[PDB]
Design a protein around this ligand. Structure first.
Ligand SMILES: [Mg+2]
Length: 419
């Protein structure tokens, strides 16, 4: 009835860096989970041996799975998520998981929950829904990354992510096709205006064209949506990652074109007014609680404001945020917090304070599909997991089709407020 084996191994992620994979064995099978990788987050433990993988090795985190966590988990009842997640946190002993590593622990937490789902005779998403007390599961609207700027692209583009989202789709099956078609349509446009080389892809599968006009990107997307055949069925999500353009010293942002926060809101207003933008992620710096707060009010009813760097999937950052009424949407990254029980706790807490929850990949991913099940089981209606391109992104989109098939034609889709 109990856990029989727990093992860790180092594997490669989608950009060629090591990460941690864990298998939990029971009489029911071998349950396998891998950890993704992207100040206030749970510690990701690396070996910093410069002779292996440029310091990025995961031997120590693996050793910690096999030598500390495993002997502690063998002989236990994998059904007990909360209890085992606490035992693992108490084994590390530190508030940020910096002795054993969040990458050692999360892998255990995930795989345990999968063994537990088998034990209960239900698919993983049904099991997660129960642990989360989700009243209705649903398939999420996929927010696909299609155009890159900021620290990723050598573009004149300053902001990190433009995303398209098939909010008027009727199912996930249709959403994925819609997203795909606009993607090919986008590539086509971009290749017309910039050339073959310009449509090669970033880490998350979208494009990094050499655009030069801060106003040329949003309309490219509108053009790709029409050419795809889906005029008026898509919305737009941004991720500014504003921290990356900011001076703690100059108190301003460098869009060198330096501008105020007051002034930078003028830009966000002109875009949400013009374009069907429904979500704005990290519009200001990760400590600009007041800059966040104002734009959130300004955009009440038009677009959600989503904390990523702001909230770092961290309860005490989230409570800070709720006090200052700084955002109303949490980016949810399981490996920033480190256990499934906490991640679920964080989701319940934001939702119960009136926030949405966008479940998210990391820029370093694996063929793992856990988050497809999580986002369904949490019922958030929103996921960000890549362009419809690159296997570490598409494995998630595919898992979502599988889940929707299993749910049957009754199965619910998307984010109501965007539908
Ligand atoms: Mg971000």
């Amino acid at each position: 009835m109990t856990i029989q084996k727990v093992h860790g191994r180092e594997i490669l992620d989608s950009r060629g860096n090591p990460t941690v994979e864990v298998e939990v064995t029971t009489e029911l099978g071998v349950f396998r989970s891998a950890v993704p990788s992207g100040i206030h987050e749970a510690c990701e433990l690396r070996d910093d041996d410069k002779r292996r993988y440029l310091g990025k090795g995961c031997l120590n985190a693996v050793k910690n799975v096999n030598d500390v966590l495993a002997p502690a988990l063998v002989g236990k009842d994998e059904l007990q998520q909360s209890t085992l997640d606490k035992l693992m946190r108490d084994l590390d002993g530190t508030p940020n998981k910096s002795k054993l590593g969040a990458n050692a622990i999360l892998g255990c937490s995930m795989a345990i929950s999968k063994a537990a789902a088998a034990r209960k005779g239900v698919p993983l998403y049904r099991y997660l829904a129960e642990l989360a007390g989700t009243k209705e599961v649903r398939l999420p609207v996929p927010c696909f990354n299609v155009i890159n700027g900021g620290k990723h692209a050598g573009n004149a583009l300053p902001f990190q992510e433009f995303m398209i989202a098939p909010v008027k789709a009727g199912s996930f099956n249709e959403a994925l096709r819609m997203g795909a078609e606009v993607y090919h349509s986008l590539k086509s446009i971009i290749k017309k205006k910039y050339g073959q080389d310009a449509v090669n892809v970033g880490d998350e599968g979208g494009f990094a064209p050499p655009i030069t006009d801060i106003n040329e990107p949003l309309p490219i997307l509108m053009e790709a949506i029409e050419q795809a055949g889906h005029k008026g069925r898509f919305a737009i999500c941004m991720d500014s990652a504003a921290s990356e353009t900011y001076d703690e010293n100059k108190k301003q942002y460098n869009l060198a074109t330096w501008v105020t926060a007051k002034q930078l809101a003028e830009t966000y207003a002109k875009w949400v007014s013009e374009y069907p933008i429904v979500s704005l992620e990290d519009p200001y710096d990760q400590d600009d609680f007041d800059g966040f707060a104002g734009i959130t009010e300004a955009l009440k009813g038009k677009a959600q404001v989503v904390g990523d760097d702001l909230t770092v999937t961290n309860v005490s950052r989230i409570k800070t945020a709720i006090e200052k009424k700084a955002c109303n949407s949490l980016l949810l990254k399981i490996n920033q917090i480190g256990t499934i029980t906490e991640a679920i706790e964080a989701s319940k807490f934001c939702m119960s304070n009136g926030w949405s929850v966008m479940v998210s990949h990391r820029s370093g991913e694996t063929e793992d599909t856990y988050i497809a099940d999580l986002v369904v089981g949490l019922g958030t209606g929103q996921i960000k997991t890549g362009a419809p391109c690159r296997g570490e992104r598409t494995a998630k989109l595919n898992q979502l089709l599988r889940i929707e098939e299993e749910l049957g034609a009754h199965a619910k889709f998307g984010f109501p407020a965007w539908s």
